[model samples]
Target: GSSGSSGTGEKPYRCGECGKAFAQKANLTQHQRIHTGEKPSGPSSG
Candidate 1:
């Protein structure tokens, strides 16, 4: 429950918020944060 797998092409984690899959669970958790609007990052404006 605390691993990103072995960088496999076969994704094992899926987001309940969205039908997105990731090879790593951490990636999934990170994506879930986006759905929750938590810790948003990236260019908001120019």
Candidate 2:
């Protein structure tokens, strides 16, 4: 039997507001940019 992807590895960084998780801290930081309104969802401006 398979335990599923959740059992594969643990996410070190976690978001307190969104209750989300990321494998790396950098990912978590970028994710927070959305919640904090620090960055746009689209690509950077020219």
Candidate 3:
């Protein structure tokens, strides 16, 4: 489920607080904090 399937096109998870959208639900959840002025710290580790 993590990997994209052929027919799905793109994942849809829209943030209600902000108009920003994310491919994953978790990402959308995190992005909602922007409405609260929360900063996301840290970079993605490879």
Candidate 4:
């Protein structure tokens, strides 16, 4: 999890279910999919 940018030097949005951060909010949304198990995949994350 790379999380997002914010001068924090690392992850900004962290997953509550876990500590996995992403490069951006879009990534987080994608991560949520794993738990929610719903979506055609619409996050900007890879």
Candidate 5:
């Protein structure tokens, strides 16, 4: 039984805003935007 099956590595990133788990930090960051109203600068050049 050398094979590990704990699956602890899955969704290691946790969203403190909603206690949701995400596989990657990018996904969590995007999700947090909804709750925190994260914007890409007030007035910036595209």
Candidate 6:
């Protein structure tokens, strides 16, 4: 009997806007904003 199960090896979660692939679903969700051209906040606060 096999103790471990076979992995699916499938990356279903992808950024629809940018088409970026991610291993985890959470990563893909965060990557979708790149398509919108939204700039992230800089380290320096004026």
The TM-score values for the models, in the order shown, are: 0.58, 0.55, 0.48, 0.52, 0.55, 0.45
| lDDT of residue 35 for candidate 1 | 72
Off by over 4 Å in 1: 1-7, 38-46
**Model 4, span 1-46: residue lDDT tens:** 6878465457788998866897689988878767675457654467
Candidate number achieving the greatest lDDT relative to the actual structure? 1
Predicted candidate 1 versus true structure: per-residue lDDT over 1-37, tens digit per residue:
6977374798878888878999888888877767785
Residue-level lDDT tens digits of model 5 in 1-46: 4876544467988999779988878878977767776566742447
Candidate 2 residue runs with Cα over 4 Å from true position: 1-8, 38-46
Name the better of 3 and 4 by TM-score.
4
lDDT of 6: 0.67
Candidate number achieving the greatest TM-score relative to the actual structure: 1
lDDT of each: 0.76, 0.75, 0.66, 0.74, 0.75, 0.67
TM-score of 5: 0.55
Return whichever of 1 and 4 wins on TM-score: 1
| All models, RMSD in angstroms | 6.5, 8.0, 4.6, 6.9, 10.3, 9.3
lDDT of 6 at 14: 70
Model 1 residue 16 lDDT score? 88
Worst 10 residues of 6 by lDDT: 36-45
